[PDB]
C-alpha cells in the first residue's frame, strides 16, 4: 500500500549511498575519548565528546591488524558501507567515519539507555506486552533491511540499545551483507543461529526471522530456547530443534514461536508467500499498531533513567586501554575504501 511506495523510495535513497559511500568525515583529534561503553570479539566502543559541537557520540574503534588476523576485512567493509547507507527509525545512525594508521573508526549516535541485555538480565524477563513492543520494531526493521537485499545476521539483546524514549536502536552491522539469494558464512552468535547456518548448506534472509524467534523467546522467558555451556552443545539443541516453553507463555506466543523457530524453510514465517505479513498479522501481534510503532507514537513500557549527556550509568564498566596509533600505516590497501 503506502509500504510499497515507502520502500521503493527507501531503496532509491539507499542505493545512491551504497553506490557512492561517505568517507573520511572526521578525525581522531576532533573528539575527547571518555569511557568504554562496550566491547565485542575484536572491537571497542567508547563514549566520546566532539570538541567543536560539544555533542557526545559512541566511537567504535577497530584495530586494523586484528581485523586482518581474524579474516574480517570484507565483513568490516560491509559493516561500514551498509551502515553509512541506511536510514530507519530503529537503526543507529552513523555520524562520522574515518581511519588512521592503525585503526578504523565508526562514530555513531550515543544511545544512552544501555543494552537491552543488561535490563533483561537484571529484571529477569519482559512481560509479553513489553517484549511485543520491542519485537514489533525488529519486525519493521528487518522488513526494511530485507527490502534492500540486506541480511543482518547478528540479532541479540547485546546489539540492541534502548534510547531515551524507550525505543530500540539496532547496532553492530558487523555481519550485515548485501546479497541476492544465498550465502554461506558461519557467523552470528551461537544461541541465535538458524539450523541451516550450522549445517553449512547455504542460507538466506530467513535466518533473521529465526533469530527473531530466538529473541522473542529470550525476551519473554528470560533465557534462550537453546542454551548450554559450550557452543557445540547449543548447536546440537538447535539442530534437534525441540523447543519447550515456559508455563506462562500465552498460547498466541507459543504459536508464533513455533512458526519462527521452524527448521522447515517452506514453513517458516517471514519466508512464505505472504512474507512479513504472516508475522504482522499473527494473533500475538493483534494489539500492535504497526504504523504507530513506526512513527514512535506508542508509549514505551520502560524508559531508562537519564542523568545528563555523557551519563553512562546504564552501561557496565570496562577496563580501559590506550588507543595506539603507529607512525607507520598498517593495512592501507586492504581498507582503501573505508
Amino acid at each position: 500500500e503506502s509500504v510499497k511506495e515507502f520502500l521503493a523510495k527507501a531503496k532509491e535513497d539507499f542505493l545512491k549511498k551504497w553506490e557512492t559511500p561517505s568517507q573520511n568525515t572526521a578525525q581522531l583529534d576532533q573528539f575527547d575519548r571518555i569511557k568504554t561503553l562496550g566491547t565485542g570479539s575484536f572491537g571497542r566502543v567508547m563514549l566520546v565528546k566532539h570538541k567543536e559541537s560539544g555533542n557526545h557520540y559512541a566511537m567504535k574503534i577497530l584495530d586494523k591488524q586484528k581485523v586482518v588476523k581474524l579474516k574480517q576485512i570484507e565483513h568490516t567493509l560491509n559493516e561500514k558501507r551498509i551502515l553509512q547507507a541506511v536510514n530507519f527509525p530503529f537503526l543507529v545512525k552513523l555520524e562520522f567515519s574515518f581511519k588512521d594508521n592503525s585503526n578504523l573508526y565508526m562514530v555513531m549516535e550515543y544511545v544512552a539507555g544501555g543494552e537491552m541485555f543488561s535490563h533483561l538480565r537484571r529484571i529477569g524477563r519482559f512481560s509479553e506486552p513489553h517484549a511485543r513492543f520491542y519485537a514489533a520494531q525488529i519486525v519493521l526493521t528487518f522488513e526494511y533491511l530485507h527490502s534492500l537485499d540486506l541480511i543482518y545476521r547478528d540479532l541479540k539483546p547485546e546489539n540492541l540499545l534502548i534510547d531515551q524514549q524507550g525505543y530500540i536502536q539496532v547496532t553492530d552491522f558487523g555481519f550485515a551483507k548485501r546479497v541476492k539469494g544465498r550465502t554461506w558464512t558461519l557467523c552470528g552468535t551461537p544461541e541465535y543461529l538458524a539450523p541451516e547456518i550450522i549445517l553449512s548448506k547455504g542460507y538466506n534472509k530467513a535466518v533473521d526471522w529465526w533469530a527473531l524467534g530466538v529473541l522473542i523467546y529470550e525476551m519473554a522467558a528470560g533465557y534462550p530456547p537453546f542454551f548450554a555451556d559450550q557452543p557445540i552443545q547449543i548447536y546440537e539443541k538447535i539442530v534437534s530443534g525441540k523447543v519447550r516453553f515456559p508455563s506462562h507463555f500465552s498460547s498466541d506466543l507459543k504459536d508464533l514461536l513455533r512458526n519462527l523457530l521452524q527448521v522447515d524453510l517452506t514453513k517458516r514465517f517471514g519466508n512464505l508467500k505472504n512474507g512479513v505479513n504472516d508475522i504482522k498479522n499473527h494473533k500475538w501481534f493483534a494489539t500492535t499498531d504497526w504504523i504507530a510503532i513506526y512513527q514512535r507514537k506508542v508509549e514505551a513500557p520502560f524508559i531508562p533513567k537519564f542523568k545528563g549527556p555523557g551519563d553512562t550509568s546504564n552501561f557496565d564498566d570496562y577496563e580501559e586501554e590506550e588507543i595506539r596509533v603507529s607512525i607507520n600505516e598498517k593495512c592501507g590497501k586492504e581498507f582503501t575504501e573505508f
Partner: peptide
C-alpha cells in the same frame, strides 16, 4: 527449573559473536 539451570550456566553474560 529451566531458569535455575540457565542461571548456573556459563553463558549468562554478554555473548561474543562467532565468525569462522
Amino acid at each position: 527449573t529451566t531458569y535455575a539451570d540457565f542461571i548456573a550456566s556459563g553463558r549468562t553474560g554478554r555473548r561474543a559473536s562467532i565468525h569462522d
